[PDB]
Amino acid sequence: ARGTLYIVAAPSGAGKSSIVNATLARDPQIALSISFTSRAMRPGEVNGQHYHFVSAEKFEQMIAAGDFFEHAWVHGDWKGTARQSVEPQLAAGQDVLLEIDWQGAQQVRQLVPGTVTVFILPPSKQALQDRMRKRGQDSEAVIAQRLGAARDEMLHFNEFDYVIVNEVFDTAVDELCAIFTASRLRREAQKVRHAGLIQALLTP
Amino acid sequence: ARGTLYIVAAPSGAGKSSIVNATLARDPQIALSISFTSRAMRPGEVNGQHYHFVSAEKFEQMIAAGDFFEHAWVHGDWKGTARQSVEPQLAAGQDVLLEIDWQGAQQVRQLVPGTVTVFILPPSKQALQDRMSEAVIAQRLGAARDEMLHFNEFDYVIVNEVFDTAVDELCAIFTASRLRREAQKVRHAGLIQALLTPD
Ligand SMILES: Nc1nc2c(ncn2[C@@H]2O[C@H](COP(=O)(O)O)[C@@H](O)[C@H]2O)c(=O)[nH]1
Ligand SMILES: Nc1nc2c(ncn2[C@@H]2O[C@H](COP(=O)(O)O)[C@@H](O)[C@H]2O)c(=O)[nH]1
């Protein structure tokens, strides 16, 4: 039985990665994917942990080679989910969670129909600024640019099945866990998981 | 934000009632709806607890008056959800849970947009038989299979193997359903407008 594909999107600085990491620790049957990006490393980021950082030429080499399940030009740099991070896992029955923008989510929706997609909103525009200057010394000009890029991402929230507002951290984690739990209870998934039981109950 | 309408159906002997009651204890923002029925009261039954018991003539008067949100002929008697048990609560932002048969669930799905329907199955054929005179027992098992044949009409399916897990799963369904986009667009309309407006 194929794994379920999950998408959790949010502008950076809304706290999605902390929510996802806490959610997966509680629900370990879902694997996280590490994206590729040609954007420059920001302070505090670790290559091979937050992203696989590569050159633009290497990334475009990987585009041309067909290495990406989805990829997109995100805020003036390449971002991408490697084919090897998703397609074999899903084919092997492993659930996979992608943290990608709306452009990537749209490509994934056309590739995998039943993807479960969640958007996480910050509790205010101010909340975005606060989390950004606690991740590293960014200039006012860069903070203004990233805030603008955040609004651009949030304009596409309506494309997602669920919306979580990250007001209380432990509550947002509970809510993302409820969404993941509920998705395994959907009729079509349960028909597969309990096919034998259903056959027994409906037999005369 | 309007309340959500939830439907939980199951054959007899699947344990649905205990799961629903335990779920309501955990989630007090959910009102349970008391159905009307024309079935005769058994000695000791309390009108207004499990049902609002009325005469068949009164039930049929309510059909004719359009008073029922949904109603059906269930196991040889009338059963019905009165409009007044649903529409005011939902309009006041209170979630409402209906315990009705598959015939009723079909009517509600067509009427109310975001209706969430859940079907609960026993963990095995033996477990169903155990929970249940040979002809009466066979009759009740036959009614159970007829009910379970319609599980495919429901959005979610819970197999009641472990009780506390079944309650967690029902709670997860209620929680997740409130996070659905269209509900959140209403609930957070002001926040969304601010976030999407430029400087
Ligand atoms: N399409 C796509 N977007 C990604 C990928 N990885 C991260 N992003 C998204 O790019 C945006 C910018 O993230 P940041 O550059 O601040 O780390 C975020 O919305 C993030 O989720 C990816 O693999 N594909
Ligand atoms: N359509 C409909 N079915 C109901 C209603 N209340 C109970 N039922 C159904 O009637 C059947 C018998 O319920 P009982 O009274 O025997 O516990 C169950 O399948 C239950 O779902 C109602 O308001 N409407």
Automatic annotation (TrEMBL), chain B:
Origin superkingdom: Bacteria
Q: Where is the Guanylate kinase-like domain?
A: 3-175
- Residues recorded as binding ADP, renumbered to this chain, are 13-18, 131, 160-161
Positions bound to GMP:
10, 12, 16, 35, 39, 42, 51, 70, 79, 99, 101, 147
Per its UniProt record, what SMART domains does this chain match? GuKc
InterPro entries found in the cross-reference section = GK/Ca_channel_bsu, Guanylate_kin-like_dom, Guanylate_kinase, Guanylate_kinase_CS, P-loop_NTPase
The EC code for this enzyme is 2.7.4.8
SUPFAM superfamilies documented for this protein: P-loop containing nucleoside triphosphate hydrolases
Q: Where in the cell is it found?
A: Cytoplasm
Offer an example of a GO molecular function term for this protein: ATP binding
Q: What is its main location?
A: cytoplasm
Q: Name one GO cellular component term.
A: cytosol
UniProt cross-references to Gene3D superfamilies, sorted A to Z: Guanylate Kinase phosphate binding domain, P-loop containing nucleotide triphosphate hydrolases
- What does it catalyze? GMP + ATP = GDP + ADP
Residues that coordinate or bind ATP: 10-17
- Keyword line: ATP-binding, Cytoplasm, Kinase, Nucleotide-binding, Transferase
Annotated positions binding GDP:
35, 39, 42, 51, 70, 79, 101
Q: Where is the signal peptide?
A: none
Q: Which family does it belong to?
A: Belongs to the guanylate kinase family.
Summary of the function given for this chain in its UniProt record: Essential for recycling GMP and indirectly, cGMP.
Protein name as it appears in the record: Guanylate kinase
Whose protein is this, by species?
Stenotrophomonas maltophilia (strain K279a)
